[PDB]
Amino acid sequence: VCASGPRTLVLLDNLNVRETHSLFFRSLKDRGFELTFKTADDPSLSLIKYGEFLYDNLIIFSPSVEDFGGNINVETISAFIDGGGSVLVAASSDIGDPLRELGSECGIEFDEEKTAVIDHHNYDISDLGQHTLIVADTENLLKAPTIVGKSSLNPILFRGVGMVADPDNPLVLDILTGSSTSYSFFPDKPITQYPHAVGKNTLLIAGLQARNNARVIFSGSLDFFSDSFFNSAVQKAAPGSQRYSQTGNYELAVALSRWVFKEEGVLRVGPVSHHRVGETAPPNAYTVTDLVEYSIVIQQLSNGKWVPFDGDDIQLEFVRIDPFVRTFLKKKGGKYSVQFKLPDVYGVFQFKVDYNRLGYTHLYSSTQVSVRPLQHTQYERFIPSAYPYYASAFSMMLGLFIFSIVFLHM
Amino acid sequence: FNYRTTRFLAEEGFYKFHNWFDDRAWYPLGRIIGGTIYPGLMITSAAIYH
Fold this sequence. Notes:
By secondary structure, chain A is α+β, with helices and mostly antiparallel strands. Helices cover 18% and strands 33% of the residues of chain A. In chain B, helix 1 (2-12) packs across helix 3 (40-49). The radius of gyration of chain B is 11 Å and the shape is elongated. Chain B: This is Dolichyl-diphosphooligosaccharide--protein glycosyltransferase subunit STT3A.
């Protein structure tokens, strides 16, 4: 079961893109996606009908188009991402304003039109002589196995517009950074001003994980997905550089597409059970310093079948305003559970699980539990240390009665 | 506040009312109703009602 349905809409600036990118589309079709190809400017385009989403995934391979046909608009795409749809965007030097605006909403800042990434040291030998076709080293690749694939990759060719991730937005993912020497500027015009992107700040590919878990990937270069790069060999122009039979573009593209479409890293939270130790049911309210058992189950989507999750870093918290207790949840019997003693302070406590990890879906669970003070009956009785006090009160009654008997009949 | 307490005491009984802890107020700290109140007014109303 795929978290996102196979229905996919493809937007192409020109029909020829399908032929040039046949390898990418064929690999996607082989996975069971139902692709439909329409021109980006086509008037009939629509995403929402009567409040329902016509398509589950959108791929915009329309870098040069100034405006979208029909009802598609930057607001509509933003709503679509909020709905949980996955979006893929491919850019180029001809980027129109809507693509830049869409990146702005997502926190990824595209550079101005006509700019290109310039690398004078790592540009491929095949480059036209403008040093804009850069051989991106795998070292810059993000250290996330789920997103990029466990397998190693050969150097990948990128040619396109650099973008900068906004620092303020935490969710932004720096999937592929540029080289230390790379920068984004207008090649013809001298660099009087500070570059928009300089050094490793420049981003070639970046990803976003929304709070609703929608995933969007922005690529600086449309050509990266082109069949030409996939088959072309790579050798750096600089002397002493090895020549590789094939690029890593094809392998990297396959891994990214799987991540965007919720084929990897998807996690679900099942029932959570809490009860007093030795009890099968949760009490209405717990007592101070009582011992309780907390159990939760988490699953992972592998190959479309849910299986027990293997994560070992999960941490449970008992919180009132700030976390009183935090501990790891042990993996026992296919479930994550721990037993602990409640704090000595009463209040409206909440159990919390916040297992957020890079590349995986963000899981949050909260259950409200009230802890109450001890009842009057529960207090200790017949304390041995208090025996002298006990003796006095009993003694007084006996003396008083004896006095009454003697006094009356004296 | 007195009205809500009076209803709880009559329906629930004195002993439960004595140990009543309310979690619906002063979130998230909570309040101990039993030990922070004056029972005189509530008891008189409940006794006549019975």
